[PDB]
Design a protein around this motif. Structure first.
Motif, PDB file in Angstrom:
ATOM      1  N   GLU A 155      74.048  -0.669  18.385  1.00 20.66           N
ATOM      2  CA  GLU A 155      74.229   0.023  17.110  1.00 20.66           C
ATOM      3  C   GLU A 155      75.595   0.748  17.045  1.00 20.66           C
ATOM      4  OE1 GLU A 155      70.289   1.714  14.859  1.00 20.66           O
ATOM      5  OE2 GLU A 155      71.225   3.051  16.339  1.00 20.66           O
ATOM      6  N   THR A 156      76.288   0.681  15.898  1.00 19.89           N
ATOM      7  CA  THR A 156      77.561   1.372  15.746  1.00 19.89           C
ATOM      8  C   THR A 156      77.284   2.856  15.470  1.00 19.89           C
ATOM      9  OG1 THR A 156      78.512  -0.693  15.023  1.00 19.89           O
ATOM     10  CG2 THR A 156      79.802   1.289  14.621  1.00 19.89           C
ATOM     11  N   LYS A 157      78.093   3.741  16.054  1.00 16.94           N
ATOM     12  CA  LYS A 157      77.955   5.185  15.939  1.00 16.94           C
ATOM     13  C   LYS A 157      78.997   5.795  14.993  1.00 16.94           C
ATOM     14  CE  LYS A 157      75.313   4.403  19.690  1.00 16.94           C
ATOM     15  NZ  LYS A 157      75.855   3.027  19.849  1.00 16.94           N
ATOM     16  N   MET A 158      78.769   7.060  14.558  1.00 14.90           N
ATOM     17  CA  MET A 158      79.643   7.833  13.664  1.00 14.90           C
ATOM     18  C   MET A 158      79.689   9.301  14.007  1.00 14.90           C
ATOM     19  SD  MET A 158      77.922   6.605  10.133  1.00 14.90           S
ATOM     20  CE  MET A 158      79.381   7.012   9.196  1.00 14.90           C
ATOM     21  N   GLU A 159      80.803   9.963  13.646  1.00 13.82           N
ATOM     22  CA  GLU A 159      80.992  11.415  13.802  1.00 13.82           C
ATOM     23  C   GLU A 159      80.637  12.145  12.471  1.00 13.82           C
ATOM     24  OE1 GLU A 159      85.266  10.052  15.396  1.00 13.82           O
ATOM     25  OE2 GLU A 159      84.987  12.234  15.577  1.00 13.82           O
TER      26      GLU A 159
END
Lengths: 159, 159
Positions: A155-159
């Motif tokens: 899964e791609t992550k975000m801030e």
């Protein structure tokens, strides 16, 4: 008075995770937090082992218990604190507690077998004999385990 | 009636993550699930971008909004679904929904709101120009993104 051999538990891939190094003065206490190897894992099996070998199976199994009632959560989320308590009489205590829920079970090993000076010397002998064969087997399991985590973090992550 | 340029959001490391690729026939609805980059992350920022560059900052920022109140949980747990719904005109309905808590936040933007067809071809040319510079940047950043995950998965696991 000291531990004749290293004590620990069997972890993912058959690896022996050391918790109390041999020749530690008794009484003693040592903790480490672990987690589940898979998604939805409701229980963890604690196999208490003794020896100097890198793979649990090559060491003496002293006791076994299972920590029950871990709520289903993804791989690696639950926080399982495993504590080794060795009292003055040299009796091994291993508790496992789900930090989240607070659910905890502990094994008291009142009597395992008899450990002879010859058994101790032999275990130290094989550990040194099979040392680089052990090192390479451990290293490979560690890569498989790390890769399992790599494949699970898709899964791609975000801030 | 297709998309003039690729649309997407900014993800970990400043990467531009496409939701709708260039020349995609509209109307169309596309989705992707994302997670937090840090332990106990309350919010996520959605930066809707347009262009073909590998890093979000090098593309046109079409919209920006914050989704707050993500219950504190470790890195990788919260399930944040990002949806891009385009109609026939070119109006994009962008939403960020926490699959768990049900909390949603949404905006509406104009992808058809582009500064001349001369510049759609300028952006396409800007991309092809910095294509090798970008693949160098992308592979460096993606290596850091993987290492961040590998480091967050150091904790020993049990079956």
């Amino acid at each position: 008075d000291v531990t004749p051999l290293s004590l620990g538990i069997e972890t993912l891939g058959g690896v022996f995770t050391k918790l109390i190094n041999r020749n530690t003065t008794i009484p003693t206490k040592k903790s480490q937090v672990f987690s589940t190897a898979a998604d939805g894992q409701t229980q963890v099996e604690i196999k208490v082992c003794q020896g100097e070998r890198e793979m649990a199976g090559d060491n003496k199994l002293l006791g076994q218990f299972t920590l029950i009632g871990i709520p289903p959560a993804p791989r690696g989320v639950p926080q399982i604190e495993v504590t080794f308590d060795i009292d003055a009489n040299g009796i091994v205590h291993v508790s496992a507690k789900d930090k989240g829920t607070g659910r905890e079970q502990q094994i008291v090993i009142q009597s395992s077998g008899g450990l002879s000076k010859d058994d101790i010397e032999n275990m130290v002998k094989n550990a040194e004999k099979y040392a680089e064969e052990d090192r390479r087997k451990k290293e490979r399991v560690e890569a498989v385990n790390m890769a399992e985590g790599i494949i699970h973090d898709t899964e791609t992550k975000m801030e």
